[PDB]
């Protein structure tokens, strides 16, 4: 997703958008997998944000828009109860917050 | 199809109240943002909600009615003559029933002349002592005024936290049979017998005698009535609807008495310097509630509050 | 809330000012709808159109129709004067 | 296709154009009169 | 002798200059007008109730706009008399009532235009009393506000009371809403004007609510809704309280009460507690119009 | 497998040039999501 | 009946007279008429366009 080239990134984003149709199978395989996909999308769009809008290249903005739309699709497909489950990651769990 | 519905977020978003600009903290100011979420877990929230509920939206007054017989100077006898039946002129009862309708104190949703049994939203001859304030009370209400007429009777054998309303206004009406007994009226001795319960509130009996004015009704032998009013002169002279030494027929007696009571109470409220309209009191109470119960959250922290379920806070 | 009772084919309410208007008997929008003496349009936060319309009293009212960038929605509301139960 | 705009962008632009064109500036007296009675009196 | 009495009373009112005498005369006029009106209702036209009321209103308004401006007690007496005459239930031409409200509004304009050194607490008290009298006149006769001129004058007076200056000016540039600085004469005048606006917007017309004349606010609260829902899940914490613009407090319940048969659609129970008073609501979300409510 | 069938007579969604009279067909597959709506012009459903 | 006075009676509820009463009540019950709202709130000219 965070590849320097944008065409391969766009193809990867489309492939991720494809997986939304099999979220039931992903849940049956591993419980936390769809939440992991949503976290991956959130982190990627956060990382690409600082150098996206403060630039004169439209391709980065278009890729950001595509990332946001895929995130919206993933959120809509998932139920509300799953989205409210806390994020379980080592770096943040080390902190007392 | 979906089953559950969190309609609150739909309502906030559809009307345009919920937005990033609305939730943004004001710059260089202390007023809260345009949208604020309160808390139902901080102790005393429901008590303050009840405080806000008990505040009325329109001014209210109180009127006491007494009956006098010749050769009476003690408060006990004056209170006693009322509670008897068939021992007074029928014109007194006719004048009473022309002041307002009758409403039970328990089922009355408005002012009833006594704090402890007022604003209760949760629903053989005895004479004019029924209206003593324990079973029934004469009531009148308009779009801008509310009056509770109560006739005191002899006394025989924190749960309602009300914020200070302001200077209570009450006017007494006395039915005298002989004009010479007007001066011999024990107004001082009956101050303790006409406590409305607002004395504990209204914090913002000798000194209260001058505050209350008195209206005297003296029937004549020709059917007309003679009126004398004491202690109703202030900065703006006297009140017009019933001047001193006036004569009024029985047709326009109750209406003129009610108008005089309204004008006197309005003048008394306007004269005092520690009085504000009830909507100002409600606005100040709302501002105090906002200051003491607002939730300090950022914009992203507030959207996620809508999706989280409520009602299980004390159960989970 | 996406799978509403009307099926996934319908997402935003299809109602408008012409519907349930006593002063206009037509089923399509027309200038007579604006000629109604009980219709008014407002702009809120410079990014929302709010339409207030007092329908004839159906019983078990105020009708609010809102148009924004997310679509259009309709609200039917009535006051509760008397006590309950 | 050149200058192709998504649905939400077109809807937002059209809504902004409508608001800008049809917005009415008036004194508070006229606004309160209109709120009190939509048709003139 | 009734005609002679009325004529001499009118002459005494016209020729009087002392304050106390004028107050007594005004009280007598109110008494006689009310008595004649009630007698006619229960049963040169100067003896007639309608003509007597018209003449009384005309004389009082003329005196108020002519001489009773530099005096406080006399002006307050005239305001109380004009407030008293509203309660009289006698058919009369709307022109007289329009003239009365026009005179009251002109008095408001004159008093609020006094120089700053002459301003005092008594002036603001008189302004508040006149606002209350105007509110009583509007409430007792909601019909006459259908006129363009009466409504325009009333709203101009309210705007002058709130903002401190009328939006329209004879020669000065006009001002619009939003870009007008708030410069009220005083806090009391501003509060009175706001109360008048709230009354004319909500209480004007249909004063007795189905809840009863005793309580203008709705007689339903959180406890009533909880005990009426008859659902163990609903508790005192099920509500979500919101504050709008630091003035309005909401209390929203996200459970249908069964009032609407559309159990398949969202329902909310807004419970507004504003500065005017408590008021309930029941909003519903509908996707299809009334033509196919039962066809879904 | 490309979507459920919708009766064109009483369909309130996207049309894509189809007609209510039934000349262009009576049924057609339909697949729509929270943000994407797709309708197929199947050639084996339109009478010829 | 001239010397007879009518006893006061409780007034009965009366339906609102205006054709825009409920919408106006809803507008003024949400604070839309407060001083602060007089900036980000306006009207729309009603015409064919």
Swiss-Prot record, chain B:
Protein name per UniProt: Ral GTPase-activating protein subunit beta
Full-sequence range covered: 1101 to 1493 of 1494
Functional note: Non-catalytic subunit of the heterodimeric RalGAP1 and RalGAP2 complexes which act as GTPase activators for the Ras-like small GTPases RALA and RALB.
Subunit structure and binding partners: Component of the heterodimeric RalGAP1 complex with RALGAPA1 and of the heterodimeric RalGAP2 complex with RALGAPA2. Heterodimerization is required for activity.
Residue ranges annotated for the Rap-GAP domain, each copy included: 49-215
Organism: Homo sapiens
Tissues in which the UniProt entry reports expression: Highly expressed in brain, mostly in amygdala.
Curated annotation (Swiss-Prot), chain C:
Top-level taxon: Eukaryota
UniProt-annotated location(s): Cytoplasm
Description of how the protein assembles with itself and partners: Component of the heterodimeric RalGAP2 complex with RALGAPB. Heterodimerization is required for activity.
Role, per record: Catalytic subunit of the heterodimeric RalGAP2 complex which acts as a GTPase activator for the Ras-like small GTPases RALA and RALB.
Protein name from the UniProt record: Ral GTPase-activating protein subunit alpha-2
UniProt organism field: Homo sapiens
Gene (UniProt): RALGAPA2
Full protein: residues contained: 1388 to 1482 of 1873
From Swiss-Prot, chain D:
Superkingdom classification of source: Eukaryota
Localization of this protein: Cytoplasm
Function: Catalytic subunit of the heterodimeric RalGAP2 complex which acts as a GTPase activator for the Ras-like small GTPases RALA and RALB.
Subunit structure: Component of the heterodimeric RalGAP2 complex with RALGAPB. Heterodimerization is required for activity.
Name of protein: Ral GTPase-activating protein subunit alpha-2
Gene: RALGAPA2
Residues of the full protein shown: 1826 to 1866 of 1873
């Amino acid at each position: 997703l965070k590849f320097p080239n944008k065409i391969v990134a766009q193809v990867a984003c489309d492939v991720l958008q494809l997986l939304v149709s099999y979220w039931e199978k992903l849940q049956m395989f591993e419980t936390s997998l769809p939440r992991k996909m949503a976290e991956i999308l959130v982190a990627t769009v956060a990382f690409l944000l600082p150098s996206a809008e403060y630039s004169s290249v439209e391709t980065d903005k278009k890729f950001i828009v595509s990332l946001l739309l895929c995130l919206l699709d993933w959120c809509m497909a998932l139920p509300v109860s799953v989205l409210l489950h806390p994020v379980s990651t080592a770096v943040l769990e080390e902190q007392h917050s | 199809p979906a089953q559950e519905f969190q309609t609150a977020r739909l309502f906030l978003s559809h009307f345009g109240f919920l937005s990033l600009e609305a939730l943004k903290e004001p710059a260089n100011s202390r007023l809260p943002p345009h949208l604020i979420a309160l808390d139902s877990t901080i102790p005393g929230f429901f008590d303050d909600i009840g405080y806000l509920d008990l505040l009325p939206c329109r001014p209210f007054d109180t009127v006491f009615i007494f009956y006098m017989k010749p050769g009476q100077k003690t408060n006990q006898e004056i209170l006693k003559n009322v509670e008897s039946s068939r021992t007074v002129q029928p014109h007194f009862l006719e004048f009473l029933l022309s002041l307002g309708w009758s409403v039970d104190v328990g089922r009355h949703p408005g002012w009833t002349g006594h704090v402890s049994t007022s604003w209760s939203i949760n629903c053989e001859d005895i004479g004019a002592s029924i209206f003593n304030g324990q079973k029934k009370v004469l009531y009148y209400a308009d779009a801008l005024t509310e009056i509770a007429f109560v006739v005191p009777s002899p006394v025989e054998s924190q749960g309602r936290p009300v914020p200070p309303l302001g200077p209570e206004t009450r006017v007494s009406v006395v039915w005298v049979e002989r004009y010479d007994d007007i001066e011999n009226f024990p107004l001082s001795e009956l101050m303790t017998e006409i406590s409305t319960g607002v004395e504990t509130t209204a914090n913002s009996s000798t000194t209260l005698e001058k505050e209350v004015p008195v209206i005297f009704i003296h029937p004549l032998n020709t059917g007309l009535f003679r009126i004398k009013i004491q202690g109703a002169t202030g900065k703006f002279n006297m009140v017009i609807p019933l001047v001193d030494g006036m004569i009024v027929s029985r047709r326009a007696l109750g209406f003129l008495v009610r108008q005089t009571v309204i004008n006197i109470c309005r003048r008394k409220r306007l004269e005092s310097d520690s009085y504000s309209p009830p909507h100002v009191r409600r606005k100040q109470k709302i501002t105090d509630i906002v200051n003491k119960y607002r939730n300090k959250q950022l914009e992203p922290e507030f959207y996620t509050s809508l999706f989280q379920e409520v009602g299980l806070k004390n159960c989970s | 809330h996406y799978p509403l009772s009307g099926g996934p084919a319908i997402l935003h309410s299809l109602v408008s000012e012409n519907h349930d208007n006593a002063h206009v008997e037509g089923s399509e929008l027309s200038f007579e709808v604006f000629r109604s003496p009980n219709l008014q349009l407002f702009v809120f936060n410079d990014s929302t159109l709010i339409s207030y319309l007092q329908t004839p009293t159906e019983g078990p009212d105020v009708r609010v129709i809102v148009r924004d960038i997310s679509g259009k929605y309709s609200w039917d509301g009535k006051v509760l004067y008397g006590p309950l139960e | 296709i050149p200058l192709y705009q998504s649905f939400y962008e077109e809807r937002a632009l059209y809504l902004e154009a409508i608001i800008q064109n049809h917005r009415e500036v008036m004194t508070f007296e006229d606004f309160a009169a209109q709120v009190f009675s939509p048709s003139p009196s | 002798l009734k005609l002679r009495l009325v004529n001499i009373l009118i002459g005494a009112l016209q020729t009087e200059t002392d304050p106390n005498n004028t107050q007594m005369i005004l009280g007598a006029m109110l008494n006689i007008v009310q008595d004649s009106a009630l007698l006619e209702a229960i049963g040169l036209n100067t003896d007639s109730a309608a003509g007597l009321l018209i003449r009384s209103i005309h004389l009082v308004t003329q005196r108020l706009n002519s001489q009773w401006r530099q005096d406080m007690s006399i002006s307050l007496a005239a305001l109380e008399l004009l407030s008293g005459l509203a309660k009289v239930k006698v058919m009369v031409d709307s022109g007289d009532r329009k003239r009365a409200i026009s005179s009251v509004c002109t008095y408001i304009v004159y008093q609020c235009s006094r120089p700053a050194p002459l301003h005092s607490r008594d002036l603001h008290s008189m302004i508040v009393a006149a606002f209350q009298c105007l509110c009583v006149w509007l409430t007792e006769h909601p019909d006459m506000l259908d006129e363009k001129d009466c409504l325009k004058e009333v709203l101009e007076i309210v705007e002058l009371g709130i903002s401190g200056s009328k939006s329209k000016n004879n020669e000065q540039e006009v001002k619009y809403k939003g870009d007008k600085e708030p410069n009220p004469a005083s806090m009391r005048v501003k509060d009175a004007a706001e109360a008048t606006l709230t009354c004319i917007m909500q209480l004007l017309g249909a004063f007795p609510s189905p809840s009863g004349p005793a309580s203008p606010c709705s007689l339903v609260n959180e406890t009533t809704l909880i005990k009426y829902s008859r659902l163990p899940t609903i508790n005192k914490h099920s509500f979500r309280y919101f504050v709008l613009d630091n003035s309005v407090i909401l209390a929203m319940l996200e459970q249908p009460l069964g009032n609407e048969q559309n159990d398949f659609f969202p329902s909310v129970t807004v419970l507004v507690r504003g500065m005017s008073g408590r008021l309930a609501w029941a909003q519903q979300l509908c996707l299809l119009p009334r033509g196919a409510k039962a066809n879904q | 497998g490309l979507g459920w069938e919708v009766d064109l007579s009483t369909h309130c969604g996207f049309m894509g040039g189809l007609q209510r009279n039934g000349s262009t067909g009576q049924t057609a597959p339909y697949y729509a999501t929270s943000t994407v709506e797709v309708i197929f012009h199947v050639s084996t459903r339109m009478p010829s | 009946s001239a010397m007879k006075v009518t006893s006061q009676g409780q007034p009965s509820p009366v339906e609102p007279r205006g054709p825009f009463y409920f919408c106006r009540l809803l507008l003024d019950d949400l604070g839309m008429n407060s001083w602060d709202r007089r900036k980000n709130f306006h009207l729309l000219k009603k015409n064919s366009k």
